[PDB]
């Protein structure tokens, strides 16, 4: 009798289960991006299929429809802000050409790797979830953070993390401890 909590699922399983085209198209999306499983790839195509349904709905409507104009710019400026639509590609005919590749680029698990400091795309994944990377002032350990356009200057090591200073962690701290009790005294 308390009001319900809305919830939804954020992915979709493909219709035909065993392909050789789709199953091997995961070469890029799992080895070249360093991903857990196919649900991280099914998640992206779900949002991307959610985008085209709204865009197809708008294109059917008349040009200079106030509904087309309002939700059109809103859909563009949301996709511009996260950096999946390029700086001037801003047209509803180009959000339909938007593919799965330039969503995984904007993930923080790759944006760490492209901005140096990671030396592997799934060395970055380990560093993120080990509470090392902070955006602005906030530590994030979610590898699917989907950074914005005014945020790439703010991926840096955390003020708490050992690689951002602040008294290195329990491995080196204990390792220096046993040389203190063996060599120091």
């Amino acid at each position: 009798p308390r009001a319900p909590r809305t919830y939804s699922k954020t992915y979709s399983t493909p219709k035909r289960p065993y392909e050789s085209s789709r199953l091997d198209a995961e070469l890029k999306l799992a080895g070249e991006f360093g991903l857990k499983n196919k649900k991280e790839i099914y998640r992206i195509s779900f949002q991307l299929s959610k985008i085209r349904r709204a865009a197809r709905d708008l294109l059917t409507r008349d040009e200079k429809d106030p509904k087309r104009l309002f939700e059109g710019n809103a859909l563009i400026r949301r996709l511009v802000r996260v950096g999946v639509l390029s700086e001037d590609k801003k047209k509803l005919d180009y959000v339909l050409a938007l593919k799965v590749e330039d969503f995984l680029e904007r993930r923080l698990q790759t944006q760490v790797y492209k901005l140096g400091l990671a030396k592997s795309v799934h060395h970055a994944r380990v560093l993120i979830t080990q509470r090392h990377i902070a955006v602005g002032k906030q530590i994030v350990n979610i590898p699917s953070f989907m950074v914005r356009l005014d945020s790439e200057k703010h991926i840096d090591f955390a003020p708490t993390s050992p690689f951002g200073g602040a008294r290195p962690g329990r491995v080196a701290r204990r390792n220096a401890a046993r040389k203190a009790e063996a060599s120091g005294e």
């Binding site: 070469l27 890029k28 070249e32």
Partner: protein, 111 residues
């Protein structure tokens, strides 16, 4: 080959050698797949890796006279008990995968 450069050469380029392999995934390796063309285009007879002169004689005893039988030995390397039979003295064309499992299952370091 194996992690020597395939991560070091992937510094923000992410595509050099990303093509698909031959594609069996349970059929054995292509260690003679190069030699298979050479015996196909050369219009004469060529000798196929003739014999096993001392890797037969010496390593049959070190493997099998120790404890084991070929019916046992071929069962742990997963080959028919006549395959090991023709690796005993002579009369085989030695391929790499069978001779590798022969080595790692019974230790004697003769290739």
């Amino acid at each position: 080959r194996s992690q020597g450069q395939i991560n070091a050469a992937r510094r923000q380029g992410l595509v050099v050698s990303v093509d698909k392999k031959y594609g069996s995934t349970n059929t054995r390796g292509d260690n003679e797949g190069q030699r298979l063309t050479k015996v196909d285009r050369e219009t004469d007879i060529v000798k196929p890796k003739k014999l096993d002169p001392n890797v037969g004689r010496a390593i049959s005893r070190a493997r099998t006279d120790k404890k084991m039988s070929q019916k046992d030995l071929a069962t742990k390397i997963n080959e028919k008990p006549t395959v090991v039979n023709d690796y005993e003295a002579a009369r085989a064309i030695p391929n790499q995968q069978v001779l590798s499992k022969l080595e790692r299952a019974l230790g004697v370091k003769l290739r």
